[PDB]
UniProtKB/Swiss-Prot annotation:
Primary gene name: TLR2
Regulation: induction: (Microbial infection) In macrophages, induced by SARS-CoV-2 infection.
Post-translational modification: Ubiquitinated at Lys-119 by PPP1R11, leading to its degradation. Deubiquitinated by USP2.
Outcome following mutation: K79R: Reduced protein stability
Part of the whole protein covered: 636 to 784 of 784
Residues in cross-link Glycyl lysine isopeptide (Lys-Gly) (interchain with G-Cter in ubiquitin): K119
Position of sequence motif ATG16L1-binding motif: 126-143
TIR domain segment(s): 4-147
Subcellular location: Membrane; Cytoplasmic vesicle, Phagosome membrane; Membrane raft
Superkingdom of origin: Eukaryota
The family this protein is said to belong to: Belongs to the Toll-like receptor family.
Protein name: Toll-like receptor 2
Species annotation: Homo sapiens
Outcome reported for the amino acid change (mutating R118Q): Reduces TLR2-mediated NF-kappa-B activation
Oligomeric and partner information: Interacts with LY96, TLR1 and TLR6 (via extracellular domain). TLR2 seems to exist in heterodimers with either TLR1 or TLR6 before stimulation by the ligand. The heterodimers form bigger oligomers in response to their corresponding ligands as well as further heterotypic associations with other receptors such as CD14 and/or CD36. Binds MYD88 (via TIR domain). Interacts with TICAM1. Interacts with CNPY3. Interacts with ATG16L1. Interacts with PPP1R11. Interacts with TICAM2. Interacts with TIRAP.
Distribution of this protein across tissues and organs: Highly expressed in peripheral blood leukocytes, in particular in monocytes, in bone marrow, lymph node and in spleen. Also detected in lung and in fetal liver. Levels are low in other tissues.
Length: 149
């Protein structure tokens, strides 16, 4: 494209909308230099259809960041479990996704048909949003690093 490339496409729920659209934006879009972000629930075109929003964004950005939370799982995760051949090499060996764990998630309650997610939860691979405000700096540092890995 012209220069319509983003550093990351960020899928997330409207319930966690504040954290993403304030906290995360300030640490990245306001960073210096800044990151270019495709905010799932802030930059999607109303007209355009659904899959066209998702797929198109994921393809115009270097990475995909999921902001996992109880809510996100129920309301927005499924679409990401079952996927349809739109990655000649599959999202498995395509740089992979960046998972942020916004809050803990009772996996004892996470379906079971959610293979991918469950893996994530065992692999305990993800940036965990620290409850201790004194440790958030390191978090953002990691996040950026990840988005630029």
């Amino acid at each position: 494209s012209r220069n319509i490339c983003y550093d990351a496409f960020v899928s997330y729920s409207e319930r966690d909308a504040y954290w993403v659209e304030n906290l995360m934006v300030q640490e990245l879009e306001n960073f210096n230099p800044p990151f270019k972000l495709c905010l799932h629930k802030r930059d999607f075109i109303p007209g355009k259809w659904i899959i066209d929003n998702i797929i198109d964004s994921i393809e115009k950005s270097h990475k995909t960041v999921f902001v996992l939370s109880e809510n996100f799982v129920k309301s927005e995760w499924c679409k990401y479990e079952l996927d349809f051949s739109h990655f000649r090499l599959f999202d498995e060996n395509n740089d992979a996704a960046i998972l942020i764990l916004l809050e803990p998630i009772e996996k004892k309650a996470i379906p079971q048909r959610f293979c991918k997610l469950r893996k994530i939860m065992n692999t305990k691979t993800y940036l965990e949003w620290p409850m201790d405000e004194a440790q958030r700096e390191g978090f953002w540092v990691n996040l950026r690093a990840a988005i630029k890995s």
